[PDB]
Design a protein around this ligand. Structure first.
Ligand SMILES: [N+]
Length: 371
């Protein structure tokens, strides 16, 4: 495995990952995406925050992870009326516009940070349900602390899970993305199998809807034995291993899990750095730390320690002078011509990206390498 040279570098990157996350956590509890990146600064995402919260919970900082769940919970309780209004609209056959839906970007005070016409996404609500249930399980906590916010998220997701929306990458609003469906599935199975939530009025409905998601992925989201980026597509996306671990469309040992890991590695992994999708022109289509971390987590869960380690080492080699992990690195670019216009508009690549550090902590934990 690892000599004490490697073990010391990996331990130090874990401790720094904890530090950069808790130091930039907002006073209100939110985890920001990236404190210094022009286009992300001032906002919080449930997707980034939930994976960040899971790394922090595995690290053992119950206080930090708890303030993030408090923040999300309170933000969702404040949307109780908005969600009830959307459901009542649906019940009158007046299907609301993307412009009326719950937001993607939040301000640290829980307001919409963006107009959901331009970035409507449902995955973050499903990831938060997964995150808070897994945190409560790990540390023996009472979910009643966050139940009223869970109720808002469940109600919203049971109504809107099958709606087209933008993918994790804010593209293709017309499509139903398999990693978005996967995130919602993980959240619903998390609350539906949670003994502390056995009397919730939605308990049975969450597992019936999770089964409806798996039926749709079965019918339109599997080609040549692997998951695909969106229903009706042949291609893969770097986010797809999340549909195995942790969101559980299939478990690690399933043939579709194996074929999906192999398709993602062949089509999108270069020397341990995982690309998002073939067409990606964002900063030239670089190699994403969080996606290398996600593939590595999935190889670990499937019993491929070696492959997991190789991805962890690749990630650790992208750490900068201070131990900060960027969003992505340009060692291999899918569309090199496009990088310059992105550096010009938005600046140097987001560094640190909190989600990079969260995913680092998860993969390190899966390999038993936390201090
Ligand atoms: N695991």
């Amino acid at each position: 495995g690892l000599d004490s040279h490697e073990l010391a570098r990996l331990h130090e990157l874990a401790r720094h990952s904890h530090a950069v996350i808790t130091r930039h956590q907002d006073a209100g509890g939110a985890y920001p995406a990236a404190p210094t990146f022009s286009a992300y600064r001032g906002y919080a995402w449930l997707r980034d925050g939930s994976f960040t919260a899971e790394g922090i919970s595995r690290y053992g900082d119950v206080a930090s992870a708890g303030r993030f769940h408090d923040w999300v919970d309170g933000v969702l309780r404040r949307r109780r009326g908005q969600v009830d209004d959307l459901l009542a609209a649906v019940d009158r056959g007046e299907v609301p516009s993307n412009e009326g839906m719950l937001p993607t970007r939040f301000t640290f005070d829980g307001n919409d940070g963006s107009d959901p016409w331009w970035d409507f996404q449902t995955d973050g609500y499903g990831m938060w349900l997964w995150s808070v249930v897994t945190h409560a399980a790990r540390h023996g906590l009472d979910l009643e602390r966050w139940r009223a916010g869970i109720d808002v998220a469940v109600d919203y997701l049971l109504a809107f899970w099958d709606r087209p929306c933008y993918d994790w990458w804010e593209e293709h609003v017309e499509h139903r993305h398999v990693s978005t469906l996967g995130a919602i599935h993980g959240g619903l199975v998390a609350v539906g199998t949670c003994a502390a939530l056995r009397s919730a009025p939605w308990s049975a409905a969450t597992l019936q809807v999770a089964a409806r998601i798996r039926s749709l992925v079965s019918a339109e989201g599997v080609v040549d034995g692997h998951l695909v980026k969106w229903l009706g597509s042949s291609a893969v996306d770097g986010s797809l291993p999340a549909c195995v671990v942790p969101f559980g469309l299939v478990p690690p040992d399933d043939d579709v899990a194996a074929m999906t890991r192999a398709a993602v590695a062949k089509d999108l992994d270069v020397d341990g750095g995982v690309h998002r999708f073939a067409a990606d022109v964002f900063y030239g289509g670089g190699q994403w730390i969080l996606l290398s971390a996600l593939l590595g987590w999935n190889l670990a869960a499937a019993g491929d320690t070696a492959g997991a380690l190789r991805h962890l080492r690749w990630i650790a080699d992208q750490a900068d002078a201070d131990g900060d992990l960027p969003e992505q690195v340009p060692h291999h670019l899918l569309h090199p011509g496009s990088r310059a216009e992105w550096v010009a508009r938005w600046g140097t690549v987001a560094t640190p990206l909190l989600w990079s550090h969260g995913m680092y902590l998860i993969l390190a934990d899966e390999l038993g390498l936390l201090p």
